[PDB]
Amino acid sequence: GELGAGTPHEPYNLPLRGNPNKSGCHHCLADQCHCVFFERLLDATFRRLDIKRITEVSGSRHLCAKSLLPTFVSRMVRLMEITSEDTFYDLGCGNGSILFQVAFLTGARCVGIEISEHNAKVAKKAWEVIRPELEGSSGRSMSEVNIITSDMTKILADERLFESERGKTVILLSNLLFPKSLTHYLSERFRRVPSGTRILCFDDLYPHSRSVAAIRDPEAFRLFAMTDYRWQECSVEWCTRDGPFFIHRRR
Ligand SMILES: Nc1ncnc2c1ncn2[C@@H]1O[C@H](CSCC[C@H](N)C(=O)O)[C@@H](O)[C@H]1O
Ligand SMILES: [Ca+2]
Ligand SMILES: [Zn+2]
C-alpha cells in the first residue's frame, strides 16, 4: 500500500490513515498491529526503571539517543523483510527499544551495540523487565537480545562478523548525528558483508541522488540495490514531520 517508486525523485511513502485501524494505529497498512501496545509497555518499563536514558549530552551531539518510535519499527519490519532466521543488529541501540520490538514481532536474534555505558546499562536492565512481560502477554518465548557496550568500530573491524549468517542479516544505522568519518567507515565496511544483507540508514552510506553517482562509484551500484523512503509523520521522536531514509540491500 506504499505510494511512490523508491527512487530519489519519488521515494516510497505511506500517508497516515485519517482514522485508526482496529488497534488504534494511524500508521500501519495492516488492520491490526502492536504499535500502541508497545508505546504503552515501553513507557511503563522505562518509568519503573530507576536508571533513566540520557537522551542528549550537551557537547557530544553524536550521543543523541532519541528514538525511532514503534510505528517506525512496525513498518521497518515489513520493509526489511525481517524473519525469525534473520539476525537484527541495531548499531547505536540507545535504550534498546528497537531490539525489544523486533524480537517480539519477528523472533529474530537481536544484537545491540552502544558506545554509551550508561544507556547500554539502561537497555540491559529494561530487557530483563520487559521480556517476561512480553512472554506472559503473548504466551511465546522471546528470541535472544544481546547488548554490547562498545564503539561499534571495534566490533565491525572483524571481517568475520556477519559472515556465518549468509545474508540473513538486518542492520539498523540511526546515524543522522553520527560523525561523517563514522558513516564513511561504515560505508566501506558494509561493501564486504554477505549478499542478502539489508541496511537501513538516514545519512546515506552510498549517496545516489545525483545522475553522476553511478559514474563516481560504480562499485556501490554493483554491490547494492538502493531504495529511498520517507519516514511516516510522527514516527520518530525528534520530529513530528516526515524525512528521508534509505535501505540498501546487498546484491
Ligand atoms: N561509535 C559508536 N558506537 C556505538 N554507538 C554509537 C556510536 N556513536 C554513536 N552511538 C550511539 O548511537 C545511538 C543513536 S540514537 C539511536 C537509538 C536507537 N537505535 C533508535 O533508533 O531508536 C546513540 O545512543 C549513540 O550513543
Ligand atoms: Ca566479507
Ligand atoms: Zn501500527
Numbering used by the authors: 45 to 295
Paper text:
In higher eukaryotes, a single DOT1 histone H3 lysine 79 (H3K79) methyltransferase processively produces H3K79me2/me3 through histone H2B mono-ubiquitin interaction, while the kinetoplastid Trypanosoma brucei di-methyltransferase DOT1A and tri-methyltransferase DOT1B efficiently methylate the homologous H3K76 without H2B mono-ubiquitination. DOT1 enzymes are highly conserved across metazoans and fungi, but not in the early-branched eukaryotic class of kinetoplastids including Trypanosoma brucei subsp., Trypanosoma cruzi, and Leishmania spp. In kinetoplastids, three DOT1-like methyltransferases have been identified, two of which (T. brucei DOT1A and DOT1B) have demonstrated methyltransferase activity toward H3K76 (corresponding to H3K79 in human and yeast) in vivo and in vitro. Both DOT1A and DOT1B represent minimal enzymes with less than 300 residues, comprised of a significantly diverged N-terminal domain (magenta in Fig. 1a, b) and a conserved C-terminal methyltransferase core domain (dark blue) that contains canonical and non-canonical methyltransferase motifs. Based on structural and biochemical analyses of DOT1A, we identify key residues in the methyltransferase motifs VI and X for efficient ubiquitin-independent H3K76 methylation in kinetoplastids. Substitution of a basic to an acidic residue within motif VI (Gx6K) is essential to stabilize the DOT1A enzyme-substrate complex, while substitution of the motif X sequence VYGE by CAKS renders a rigid active-site loop flexible, implying a distinct mechanism of substrate recognition.
To investigate the implications of these differences on the structural level, we determined the X-ray crystal structure of DOT1A and compared it to human and yeast active-form DOT1-nucleosome complexes. Δ42-DOT1A crystallized in complex with the methyl donor product AdoHcy in two different crystal forms (space groups C2221 and P212121), and their structures were determined at 2.1 and 1.9 Å resolution, respectively. The asymmetric units of the C2221 and P212121 space groups contain one and two DOT1A enzymes referred to as Molecules I to III, respectively. All three molecules are highly similar with a root-mean-square deviation (rmsd) of ~0.3 Å comparing 234 pairs of Cα atoms. The methyltransferase motifs I, II, and III are highly conserved among DOT1 enzymes including DOT1A and DOT1B, and electron density of AdoHcy in the crystal structures of DOT1A are clearly observed in all three molecules. Specifically, AdoHcy is recognized by DOT1A Asp134 (motif I), the Gly136 main chain (motif I), Glu158 (motif II), Met196 (motif III), and Phe222 (adjacent to motif IV). In DOT1A molecules I and II of the two crystal forms, the CAKS sequence-containing loop FH lacks electron density and is disordered, implying flexibility. In DOT1A molecule III, this loop is ordered (colored in purple), which is likely due to stabilization by a symmetry-related molecule in the crystal.
